[PDB]
Amino acid sequence: ASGALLQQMNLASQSLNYELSFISINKQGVESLRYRHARLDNRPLAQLLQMDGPRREVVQRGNEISYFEPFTLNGDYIVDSLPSLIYTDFKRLSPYYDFISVGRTRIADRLCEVIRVVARDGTRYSYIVWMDTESKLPMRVDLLDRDGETLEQFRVIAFNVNQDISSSMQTLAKANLPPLAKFSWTPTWLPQGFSEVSSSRRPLPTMDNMPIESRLYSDGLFSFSVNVNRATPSSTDQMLRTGRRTVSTSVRDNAEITIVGELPPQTAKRIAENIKFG
Amino acid sequence: ATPASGALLQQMNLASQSLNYELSFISINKQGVESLRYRHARLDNRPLAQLLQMDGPRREVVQRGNEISYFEPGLEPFTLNGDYIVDSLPSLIYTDFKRLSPYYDFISVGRTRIADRLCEVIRVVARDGTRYSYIVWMDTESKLPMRVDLLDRDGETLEQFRVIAFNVNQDISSSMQTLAKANLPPLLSEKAKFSWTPTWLPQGFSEVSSSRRPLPTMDNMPIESRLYSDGLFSFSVNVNRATPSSTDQMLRTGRRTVSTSVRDNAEITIVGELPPQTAKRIAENIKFGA
Ligand SMILES: CC[N+](C)(C)CCCS(=O)(=O)[O-]
Numbered sequence: 046a047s048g049a050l051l052q053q054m055n056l057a058s059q060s061l062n063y064e065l066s067f068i069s070i071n072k073q074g075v076e077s078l079r080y081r082h083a084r085l086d087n088r089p090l091a092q093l094l095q096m097d098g099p100r101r102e103v104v105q106r107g108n109e110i111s112y113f114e115p116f117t118l119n120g121d122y123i124v125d126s127l128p129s130l131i132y133t134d135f136k137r138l139s140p141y142y143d144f145i146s147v148g149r150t151r152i153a154d155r156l157c158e159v160i161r162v163v164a165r166d167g168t169r170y171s172y173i174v175w176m177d178t179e180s181k182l183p184m185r186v187d188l189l190d191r192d193g194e195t196l197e198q199f200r201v202i203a204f205n206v207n208q209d210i211s212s213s214m215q216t217l218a219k220a221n222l223p224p225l226a227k228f229s230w231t232p233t234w235l236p237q238g239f240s241e242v243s244s245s246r247r248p249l250p251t252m253d254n255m256p257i258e259s260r261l262y263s264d265g266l267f268s269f270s271v272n273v274n275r276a277t278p279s280s281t282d283q284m285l286r287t288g289r290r291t292v293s294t295s296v297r298d299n300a301e302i303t304i305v306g307e308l309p310p311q312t313a314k315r316i317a318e319n320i321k322f323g
Numbered sequence: 324a325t326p327a328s329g330a331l332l333q334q335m336n337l338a339s340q341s342l343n344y345e346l347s348f349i350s351i352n353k354q355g356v357e358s359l360r361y362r363h364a365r366l367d368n369r370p371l372a373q374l375l376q377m378d379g380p381r382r383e384v385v386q387r388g389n390e391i392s393y394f395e396p397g398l399e400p401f402t403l404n405g406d407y408i409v410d411s412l413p414s415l416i417y418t419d420f421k422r423l424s425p426y427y428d429f430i431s432v433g434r435t436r437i438a439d440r441l442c443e444v445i446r447v448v449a450r451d452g453t454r455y456s457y458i459v460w461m462d463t464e465s466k467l468p469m470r471v472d473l474l475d476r477d478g479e480t481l482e483q484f485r486v487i488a489f490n491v492n493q494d495i496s497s498s499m500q501t502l503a504k505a506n507l508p509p510l511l512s513e514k515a516k517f518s519w520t521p522t523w524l525p526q527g528f529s530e531v532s533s534s535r536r537p538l539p540t541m542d543n544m545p546i547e548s549r550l551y552s553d554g555l556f557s558f559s560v561n562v563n564r565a566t567p568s569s570t571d572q573m574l575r576t577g578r579r580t581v582s583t584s585v586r587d588n589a590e591i592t593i594v595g596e597l598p599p600q601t602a603k604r605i606a607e608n609i610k611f612g613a
């Protein structure tokens with residue numbers, strides 16, 4: 046029951062005290078991170094630290110996420126390294142994802158269940174998760190191409206679980222932190238599972254205050270934005286894929302459509318070229 | 324009010340040999356990113372160590388005094404004599420920097436954060452431009468190595484050692500305490516002078532041992548070996564009787580260079596952590612009948 050195992054991983058991630066020492070591998074290279082999580086006063090407490098170079102820090106205290114290099118904002122979880130699929134509602138996903146068992150294997154000196162998370166309609170990237178058989182915490186996570194090429198890799202190098210909370214986190218618990226629309230277009234085609242999260246109109250940083258209209262879509266796991274703005278003679282069709290960011294611009298009619306998010310290029314384009322106007 | 328680079332390096336060496344610690348590190352090279360764990364302690368005025376491969380089959384290597392035991396996937400384990408576990412730590416760590424200094428330069432490149440620690444950054448370069456070099460990041464408190472790169476003469480990195488998490492001075496683990504008293508696999512099993520010597524060696528190198536060994540051939544063809552080291556890098560000069568099938572060739576993989584040259588009736592093959600150019604220069608400077 047992979048579905049159940051994945052739900053358990055999510056739950057372990059949200060409710061245990063733990064420290065993960067892990068590396069993030071992608072085209073940029075091998076980055077060294079530390080994540081600490083705890084529960085204190087029935088409230089989440091977390092720290093993501095960049096280990097090498099300048100001291101980039103991010104902390105979570107309840108729904109306050111404070112960033113450091115010096116602000117804070119609201120959110121239910123730290124984003125985009127610590128594998129956002131760890132905070133995924135897998136019950137929400139099951140109708141349109143397959144969870145596939147690929148057996149057990151040693152990662153980080155632990156026996157792990159290995160599970161593929163694939164969207165049924167062949168439309169998105171996929172994950173494969175190695176989870177600790179005891180703690181249920183994620184030991185390794187690969188983000189994969191539709192062609193099986195790896196875009197991003199999360200690998201735990203050392204960890205501990207169930208220990209009492211660091212002086213750091215014990216401090217952070219009390220320490221004071223920094224604290225801080227209707228469109229004329231819709232997408233006619235979205236991959237099975239996606240639904241709108243928010244809409245916004247934003248003035249572009251240009252001499253004309255030219256609006257850009259954005260819809261944020263998510264399927265509980267992957268997310269992207271559809272951005273529309275009035276076309277100019279300098280607007281062009283183009284595709285850029287780096288890692289998990291695809292930027293797909295297409296010009297249709299008098300509009301500049303740009304899709305930004307975790308999507309195979311093909312899918313982004315298919316969305317772009319299915320927006321109905323008027 | 325900060326020490327010369329050589330004093331720092333000596334400190335790191337000392338820290339490595341006398342502290343109890345655990346390094347969780349990755350070694351990066353053309354193979355990929357491999358995840359290792361190294362534990363070191365001293366118990367009964369004796370070294371105690373464990374190198375564990377963290378992913379896949381459970382490859383383990385352990386040190387107890389001067390015995391090194393090798394544990395493997397579905398294999399009978401064995402023990403050898405050795406002063407330290409190899410392919411663990413970069414060899415750089417066991418180095419005697421007092422010894423190296425007449426022929427190496429130790430160059431400060433400042434301080435930087437590795438593994439949430441302020442580190443001194445130091446290049447270790449051989450003065451005669453003859454070898455690969457290292458750059459070390461060393462924890463400013465513990466003195467332990469936090470990162471180590473081995474570099475081409477062109478600055479390309481051949482191998483990288485990076486600690487991801489570590490602890491120091493913490494109690495010797497009950498796993499390690501078990502090892503001290505554990506049953507180790509039984510220890511598993513020539514002294515001569517030759518007619519040839521290398522006339523050119525990089526500044527610093529000196530002979531470690533000599534041996535004559537019968538090759539695994541129908542004729543019991545001897546092969547004569549001199550092991551050289553400079554305290555950091557090491558190589559062997561191997562001579563054997565040339566055959567019609569003996570050819571000049573160079574193979575460099577990572578930090579193994581195999582350089583064969585045939586001069587006169589001899590097949591000379593140099594094996595070790597040396598730039599190809601240097602290996603060849605040694606091979607083609609052996610005299611015979613000295
Ligand atoms: C086939 C070549 N590219 C564009 C990289 C496609 C890779 C597969 S996909 O759809 O997941 O991006």
Ligand SMILES: CC[N+](C)(C)CCCS(=O)(=O)[O-]
Nearest residue numbers: 474475476477597598599600
């Ligand atoms: C000079 C070109 N090659 C041999 C490829 C670069 C290696 C330089 S080396 O071996 O001395 O570091």
